[PDB]
Amino acid sequence: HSPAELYRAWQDLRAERPQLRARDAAALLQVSEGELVASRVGIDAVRLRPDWAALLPALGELGPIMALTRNEHCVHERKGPYREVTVSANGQMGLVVSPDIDLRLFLGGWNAVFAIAEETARGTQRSIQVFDQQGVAVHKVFLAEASDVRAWEPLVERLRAAEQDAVLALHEPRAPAAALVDAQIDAAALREGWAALKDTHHFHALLKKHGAQRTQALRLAGGEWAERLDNGDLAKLFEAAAESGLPIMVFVGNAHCIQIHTGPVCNLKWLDDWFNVLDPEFNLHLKTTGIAELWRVRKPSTDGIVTSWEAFDPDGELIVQLFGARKPGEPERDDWRELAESFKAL
Ligand code: HEM
DSSP states (O other), X not given: OOHHHHHHHHHHHHHHOTTOOHHHXXXXXXXXXXXXXXXXXXXXXXXXXXXXXXXXXXXXXXXXXXXXEEOSSXXXXXXXXXXXXXXXXXXXXXXXXXXXXXXXXXXXXXXXXXXXXXXXXXXXXEEEEEEETTSOEEEEEEXXXXXXXXXXXXXXXXXXOSSOOSSOOOOOOOOOOOOOOGGGSOHXXXXXXXXXXXXXXXXXXXXXXXXXXXXXXXXXXXXXTEEEEOTTHHHHHHHHXXXXXXXXXXXXXXXXXXXXXXXXXXXXXXXXXXXXXXXXXXXXXXEGGGOXXXXXXXXXXXXXXXXXXXXXXXXXXXXXXXXXXXXXXXXXXHHHXXXXXXXXXX
């Protein structure tokens, strides 16, 4: 097929199935979302340069936006101004640090970026959308009610790519080391290192060190460090936290982007298999059925023990993580720890 052909095929599908979102439609059309979006260029999308160092700070020009980051089973939507942005010297790491938009950006796999200005009945819905080497969405930022609409066009023109294009280059997915079996992991060393952890940020390196998958290490850590929970407990913890006003942290990401909410959750709702947070500045959409394992995890650090809940899919990938709200230098709060431990292990 061609990009003109793809665009047409998609519009035909959406006419048939207006509930279908871009990501769903792309799958039905047997292409990546990135490809689908590129089929839009010259119609209602403009391809931008992948110049993250200029683009990311510039989004701050737009005022309050909505940032959307998801994986297969969980969608995180947070509202606020896109600041404060810092991008590393080597241009491979980005941060957005603020009480609202709070992001960790791993720019290396970021491949293509488009500015979309989509006709609505009456207005136009504008978004910046980023895609990875495989065409899978990385991160999106949506203009909303309160955005500075006049920043839009100058931003697009400044970042507009020379070759507008509608094809999109994609790379074949890169090496998966085969997992070791549990019996091949040095469990004592891993536990020793676990006990020695000084900052929750060092966890990743610890896994790399012993060659263990994250779920695998939890399994081998022992009950004092990690315990499996009934999968249905996660929604219940949200419900209990809603009940008390406890400020929590909710981490949701994919291989290339992590988005964080800090604060309480208040308004919660089920719709079918979806468990939802539905607050004015924060929406969360969790497909509970996609959760294969749920762990309570405890990690030592310089600020003391940090307790979190970590939900995984069938592939061993993290859906969402919960912590208590905390500043580096402060220990976690008792109310959080009490709630996190209140639930019975399997
Ligand atoms: C700039 C200041 C930063 C602040 C204030 C911050 C704050 C936090 C806090 C409070 C937590 C949870 C509580 C704790 O574990 O101590 C956390 C966890 C985390 N942060 Fe950061 N962070 C920062 C920078 C970064 C950076 C640069 C990265 C790069 C990836 C990152 C990635 C993570 C990840 C993955 C976790 C989850 C840890 C786990 O698995 O236990 N953060 N951060």
